[PDB]
Design a protein around this ligand. Structure first.
Ligand SMILES: CN(C)C(=O)[C@@H](NC(=O)c1cnccc1-c1ccc(C(F)(F)F)cc1)c1cc(C(F)(F)F)cc(C(F)(F)F)c1
Lengths: 120, 121
């Protein structure tokens, strides 16, 4: 059964109506967030293991929009339970995504590659 | 930054510039990989444009694509376009594995490997 996906800009991957773009130039969390904002987007937000099962295929670790009450996303929403295994890697208030559905606590100032996400 | 729809594609496939891609991690020889994609109304990965398929720069590891040597051409019988892939020998054979960036590694067609299927409506 075929269906259309998006909408998304042309250079973004579309999957279950979310749009993803990988950035390989390393930036700290704040610079990564600013980069995504300049593309009318945000850093990766993880909300569903089903809608976002493609994240099982992501290799290496990349900034997502999770920051430190509890951890929260850029949009102010809380991290849903039973989505990510949080592991402590560095003293930090930001998190990297790693497969499969892990979040590494990371110094916000450390340069990393990053994933932007859009949903119209 | 202009928005457009991508596809159509089945829901469990990645869509990029209106092509649909699916990665398969259960390793199969080239022929069984071809048959698996066919059972999904698809073919093994065909590389026809660096610009429309620039996401392939981000593909890690090595995966069957639909490129074969008649003792190079694609499953559909079309010939490999120039200026697309750098073909490197690895294991004696008549089939090729895709690797980043826009490389093809020659591989025995009977060797089990992961594979990428591609659909286009
Ligand atoms: C599945 N295999 C065998 C890989 O090679 C994976 N590579 C990396 O994740 C990968 C490897 N090095 C650098 C960057 C990436 C990467 C990071 C974020 C995204 C995202 F923007 F999507 F979030 C996509 C790729 C892979 C996974 C996926 C996805 F989306 F399913 F996760 C798509 C591809 C693509 F089609 F683009 F090539 C490749």
């Amino acid at each position: 059964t075929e269906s259309y996906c998006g909408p998304c800009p042309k250079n973004w991957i579309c999957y279950k109506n979310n749009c993803y773009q990988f950035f390989d130039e390393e930036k700290n969390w704040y610079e990564s967030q600013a980069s995504c904002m300049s593309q009318n987007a945000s850093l990766l937000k993880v909300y569903s293991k089903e809608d976002q099962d493609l994240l099982k295929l992501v290799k290496s670790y990349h900034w997502m929009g999770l920051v430190h009450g509890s951890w929260q996303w850029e949009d102010g929403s809380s991290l849903s339970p039973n989505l990510l295994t949080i592991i402590e890697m560095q003293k930090g208030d930001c998190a990297l995504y790693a497969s499969s559905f892990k979040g590494y606590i990371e110094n916000c100032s450390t340069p990393n590659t990053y994933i932007c996400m859009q949903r119209t």
